[PDB]
Subunit: 404 residues, 2 copies
């Protein structure tokens, strides 16, 4: 009766294998660049994920005690919270961390998706921004994806963001009634957030007015930092395109911002004020995240198929009812060094052999009255048809010599 | 400021590696026995986890829409729910499944723990019960644990459980006031549940009365099934002990029940009526679960230590400020086939070499004005002290020939 809640789903067979490949690939590239693997809890205190003061899409609840708890909606805040909790500030900087795991989004019935996160905390050095970009680019390239579009941009320093917001107030105020609910309130609290709302009505006005990009407002230091990042990518042969449409409305996002399109598979940027937001000292940061499901779809779109599940090394066919137990005893004697399976009911040799072929077994085994009395087994290498009769003590060795 | 909620914790370094080893080991033994890996969602409809009608320890909440949702507290019901949803009843039976993942328990501030689950659904054959036991025993043995105590027992068939409950009413009724709240109510709804309550007051009365074990109430079929299971373990050289104290109060638990002690690392048994409880047809089942943290503690108790984290293949030391970027370009050219790291600031050769030793690098690399002008690099195999000067084009090949 009960089914998996909408927005969630079981992962098994090929879908699971695709997810595991994707994560295994990120693990290889990220750990080769020094990132340390970190796994945070599924839920945390709600305040860990609050973005600041400024007036539904997060699973929140309180446990026995009244404490507000929230299901992890993103990875960055949780990782920064971990860097703080474990005093990673004492480690050699920067501290590179990565993580793969489920995230929770509360939309109307993906509500549970998986993403890989990479975070370099502790330094403002532009080399780290270029590295974050290249690392994301690489994870995706290593997966076999091609036609990857890298989009780069900057959101400047907070003093630069202050001027832009003023400008936004001047340009968007005389068009107030064109916005709506929240966007009208954002004009007084955080104008830049209006550029990040997915309100078709708000997106419409913006498209018509065509206001100036945050790029045109980069301060002195911000422009030099972006130029450094650009220089590194050029030097690393990473094709990119400056994107004035790339924006980050939250007050803790600074300088570098980037995305990789195929539509966006992942992206990220620098976020220097998030640590203080959580109660910690100043901790410069830059990193990215990409959705595992988004990537699996991109691979699927490019035609990437996955080979068939490997079969057991041995599939035992009991011929009599008494042999069923003996098949189990033999298979157990061969595990786990070898993958050995067995049928639970007797059947004709031909039908059993037929089942071994379908299951892709390397060898088929037969146990009947004759082999039981002799304490032996009959083996048949399916691929070559070669059939041999050997004692039970010799099966492990024989199979190992053959499957070497 | 904000810390991981009590009962939860970040996993990194050795602790994480220990968890990954444990799961990797279960994966090897369980998949060698034919189990298919399955990953269910973190949360599901509350009804998936309700055990039946009979009057706090589960994180429950409703999403936008009023639907009651619950954080996964166990693995079995979720797996059975998956077997049903995907029509696994059509697959060749039995269907063997396994899963590893977080579970949630709502105690007063582990509230988030991890466990490995194994489930064989679709058959009543006693061979499967013995296999579940041996498989659990094996997972633990392969981890290096010794002094593993296997305890076996049975809870009989529902008709057997009915008689026992009557008996329990007769023996425990005249002692009503000795029980408490729930236990008093259980006498009328499900007496056997009183044997499963962790109420020190209830455990006391039980210890004094010393009522008869559910074992003394096994019906004809139930006694024969248990004898079959025992026969298989004997034949598999698995040392076990019959435990009359092992009980399963819920109405869907049937026959086989078992545990492995070291205090219990894991356990399980047959549960034939759970499927119907969820709205599906009759689906016989048997399996087990063990806590990853329980196992890591057991390993720790036996002294099992984990080797040190491997170091990068190459740690680049820039000698000048301009070389910092060049160190990054070189490391990126070597990744991800090789693990290459670099320092972000210049430093003396000796200090840099000093850092490479501490980080356990196979090779140390040096980039200064001289190598930059020559488009070369200086490498030093730390273990042998051998130092060589080669061009950048030759570094990948040289390192690969040396780290082969």
């Amino acid at each position: 009766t009960a089914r998996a809640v909408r927005g969630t789903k079981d992962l098994f067979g090929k879908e699971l294998r695709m997810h595991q490949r994707i994560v295994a690939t990120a693990r290889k590239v990220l750990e080769a660049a020094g990132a340390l693997e970190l796994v945070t809890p599924i839920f945390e205190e709600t305040q860990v994920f609050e973005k600041g003061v400024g007036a539904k899409e997060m699973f929140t609840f309180q446990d026995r005690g009244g404490r507000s708890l929230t299901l992890r909606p993103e990875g960055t805040a949780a990782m920064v919270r971990a860097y703080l909790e474990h005093g990673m500030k004492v480690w050699p900087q920067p501290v590179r961390l990565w993580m793969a795991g489920p995230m929770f989004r509360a939309e109307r019935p993906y509500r549970q998706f998986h993403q890989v996160n990479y975070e370099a905390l502790g330094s403002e050095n532009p080399i780290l921004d270029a590295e974050a970009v290249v690392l994301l680019y690489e994870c995706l390239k290593e997966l076999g994806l091609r036609r990857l579009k890298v989009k780069l941009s900057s959101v400047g320093d907070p003093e630069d963001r202050a001027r832009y917001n003023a400008y936004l107030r001047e340009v968007l105020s005389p068009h107030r009634e064109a916005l709506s609910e929240d966007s009208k309130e954002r004009l007084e609290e955080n104008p830049m957030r209006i550029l990040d709302s997915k309100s078709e009505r708000d997106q419409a006005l913006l498209k018509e007015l065509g206001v100036r990009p945050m790029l045109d407002f980069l301060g002195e230091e911000a422009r030099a930092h972006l130029k450094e990042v650009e220089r590194h990518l050029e030097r690393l042969s990473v094709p990119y395109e400056l994107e004035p449409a790339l924006v980050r409305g939250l007050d803790y996002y600074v300088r570098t911002a980037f995305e990789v399109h195929h539509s966006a598979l992942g992206g990220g940027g620098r976020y220097d004020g998030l640590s203080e937001l959580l109660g910690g000292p100043r901790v410069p940061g830059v990193g990215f995240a990409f959705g595992v499901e988004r990537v699996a779809l991109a691979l699927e779109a490019e035609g990437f198929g996955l080979p068939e599940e490997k079969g057991p090394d041995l599939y035992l066919i009991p011929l009599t009812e008494e042999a069923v137990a003996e098949a189990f005893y033999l298979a157990e004697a061969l595990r786990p060094r070898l993958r050995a399976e067995y049928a639970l009911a007797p059947r004709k040799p031909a039908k059993g052999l037929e089942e071994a072929l379908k299951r892709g077994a390397a060898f088929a085994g037969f146990l009947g009255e004759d082999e039981l009395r002799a304490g032996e087994v009959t083996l048949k290498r399916l691929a070559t048809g070669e059939q041999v009769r050997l004692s039970r003590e010799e099966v492990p060795g024989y199979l190992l010599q053959a499957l070497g």
